[PDB]
Amino acid sequence: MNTVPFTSAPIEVTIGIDQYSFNVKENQPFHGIKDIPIGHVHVIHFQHADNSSMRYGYWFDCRMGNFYIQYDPKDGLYKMMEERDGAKFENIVHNFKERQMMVSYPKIDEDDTWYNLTEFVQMDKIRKIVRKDENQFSYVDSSMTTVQENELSDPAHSLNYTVINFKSREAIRPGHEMEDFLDKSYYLNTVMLQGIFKNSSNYFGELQFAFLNAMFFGNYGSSLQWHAMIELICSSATVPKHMLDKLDEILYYQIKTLPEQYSDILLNERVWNICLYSSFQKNSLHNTEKIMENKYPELL
Amino acid sequence: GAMNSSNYAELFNNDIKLFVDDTNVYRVTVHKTFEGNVATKAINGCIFTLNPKTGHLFLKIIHTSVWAGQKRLSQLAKWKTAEEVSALVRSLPKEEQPKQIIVTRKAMLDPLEVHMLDFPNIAIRPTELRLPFSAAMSIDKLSDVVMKATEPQMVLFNIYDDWLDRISSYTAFSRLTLLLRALKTNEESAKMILLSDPTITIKSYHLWPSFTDEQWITIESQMRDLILTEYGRKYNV
Numbered sequence: 001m002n003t004v005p006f007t008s009a010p011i012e013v014t015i016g017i018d019q020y021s022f023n024v025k026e027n028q029p030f031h032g033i034k035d036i037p038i039g040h041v042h043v044i045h046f047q048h049a050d051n052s053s054m055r056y057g058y059w060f061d062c063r064m065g066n067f068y069i070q071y072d073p074k075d076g077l078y079k080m081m082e083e084r085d086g087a088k089f090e091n092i093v094h095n096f097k098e099r100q101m102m103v104s105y106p107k108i109d110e111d112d113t114w115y116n117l118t119e120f121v122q123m124d125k126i127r128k129i130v131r132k133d134e135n136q137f138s139y140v141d142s143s144m145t146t147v148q149e150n151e152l153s154d155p156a157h158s159l160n161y162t163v164i165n166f167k168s169r170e171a172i173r174p175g176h177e178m179e180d181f182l183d184k185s186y187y188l189n190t191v192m193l194q195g196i197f198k199n200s201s202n203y204f205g206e207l208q209f210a211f212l213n214a215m216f217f218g219n220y221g222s223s224l225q226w227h228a229m230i231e232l233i234c235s236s237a238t239v240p241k242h243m244l245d246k247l248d249e250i251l252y253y254q255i256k257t258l259p260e261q262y263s264d265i266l267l268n269e270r271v272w273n274i275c276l277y278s279s280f281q282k283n284s285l286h287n288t289e290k291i292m293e294n295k296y297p298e299l300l
Numbered sequence: 301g302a303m304n305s306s307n308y309a310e311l312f313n314n315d316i317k318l319f320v321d322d323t324n325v326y327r328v329t330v331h332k333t334f335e336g337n338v339a340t341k342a343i344n345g346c347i348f349t350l351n352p353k354t355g356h357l358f359l360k361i362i363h364t365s366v367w368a369g370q371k372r373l374s375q376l377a378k379w380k381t382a383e384e385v386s387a388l389v390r391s392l393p394k395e396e397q398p399k400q401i402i403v404t405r406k407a408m409l410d411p412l413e414v415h416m417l418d419f420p421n422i423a424i425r426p427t428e429l430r431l432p433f434s435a436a437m438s439i440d441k442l443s444d445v446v447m448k449a450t451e452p453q454m455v456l457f458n459i460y461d462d463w464l465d466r467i468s469s470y471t472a473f474s475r476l477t478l479l480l481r482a483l484k485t486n487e488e489s490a491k492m493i494l495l496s497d498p499t500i501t502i503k504s505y506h507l508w509p510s511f512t513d514e515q516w517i518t519i520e521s522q523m524r525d526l527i528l529t530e531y532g533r534k535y536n537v
């Protein structure tokens with residue numbers, strides 16, 4: 001079990017760690033998050049009390065280094081950093097743990113929610129979507145735009161999700177216009193799965209990361225990416241059976257976790273009605289259809 | 301964006317544009333079977349592709365054989381239309397290719413957009429105008445070439461005959477849409493108006509009678525009356 005220690009908390013802030021959150025008051029003696037489960041990526045995220053504008057945060061994996069958080073009064077935010085001196089870092093964390101200045105990652109033993117939301121998410125792929133190679137962790141916030149959004153403005157600060165566009169030459173084989181537009185199996189299986197992602201695990205990883213950035217930061221371009229990746233599968237008549245069963249589980253846990261009060265802005269009515277009730281896969285997402293119908297029957 | 305009454309003169313500027321109407325592509329007769337069920341029999345159709353500035357009409361005849369063994373024909377008809385319009389554009393020299401294609405029905409937008417991906421600079425636009433191009437098969441010479449076709453065929457016409465020698469393309473289009481609206485609202489009456497006077501004939505190389513300017517004013521008035529009438533007979537006013 002690993003720790004993300006904090007120098008101090010000089011400004012009042014709501015701190016998120018994965019699906020959990022807690023309020024820290026201005027100058028409260030708060031020195032970290034301990035008992036973080038090894039084996040998963042994690043996200044530590046922030047919303048300042050005085051400017052709820054800009055949720056921001058950091059994706060990280062404690063197996064890759066010793067990370068600490070410290071408030072920068074010039075840039076006005078909590079920054080993740082890496083300490084290369086391991087003994088020094090162990091000594092700092094041990095001191096905070098003895099003075100009981102940390103909150104404990106509050107995982108219930110029965111609870112597989114975080115695993116289920118991050119099953120295919122790998123830090124190495126996060127770092128290719130979020131390019132900042134000098135750090136082992138990745139910063140994301142509410143305003144960052146995607147490569148596709150920028151085509152339709154700073155490249156270094158963009159989310160390099162895989163571009164999906166149903167009315168594009170990449171999606172439509174010359175001579176199969178009607179076929180490929182009405183059944184996207186070519187685009188899913190040859191262009192995207194075989195060609196770009198290489199396997200369905202990497203596809204699901206990007207889909208899961210896009211959902212999590214939409215939910216935790218209200219990142220609009222990530223929400224677009226999540227829905228596009230769902231729609232591409234549901235609009236394909238030919239999908240491997242293991243992928244459909246896994247997609248149903250993925251979406252089930254995403255819909256289960258979504259704040260009930262954000263459903264209006266994080267769920268696209270057109271995509272979900274099309275996917276559950278009109279698409280080729282309308283009968284292939286039993287778990288997802290059942291939770292959607294019981295939790296958000298208004299959207300449908 | 302969409303084409304409507306506000307940007308109407310744009311049709312007659314010097315940017316090449318085509319209207320595409322697909323309402324006569326897939327045509328059927330509905331009939332009873334010996335068992336008392338209902339079935340359809342396709343008949344030949346046509347794509348109506350029109351340059352409103354020049355009157356040039358590219359009439360692609362759709363022979364019933366293109367439907368043989370196909371399912372979901374009303375959906376296929378939109379994609380077939382888009383395939384044929386795309387092939388027509390590619391067949392034209394670059395300086396004759398349109399800068400815009402206006403579709404009369406919004407369901408043609410995605411099929412045409414997908415078929416024209418190779419032409420990113422050609423704008424595909426809908427329209428808010430309710431244009432009467434479905435009545436093109438009430439023009440006798442157009443109906444005749446469609447029904448006589450035994451194979452796919454493209455036939456070129458000028459739907460304005462020689463009117464542009466005497467009038468502008470705005471006025472020619474207005475005359476065409478009035479004639480077609482009348483033929484659409486009461487075909488029998490409209491055709492009676494156009495031909496009642498046997499001394500006015502249709503030239504072999506024309507679609508409409510050889511009216512003088514004064515006779516066109518009379519004809520045009522008779523068509524407006526017909527349309528307003530029918531609007532009464534219909535609504536009782």
Ligand SMILES: COc1cccc(CC(=O)O)c1
Binds near residue numbers: 067089093
């Ligand atoms: C607050 O946790 C840590 C851990 C390692 C280094 C630091 C920064 C320091 O040396 O003060 C902080």
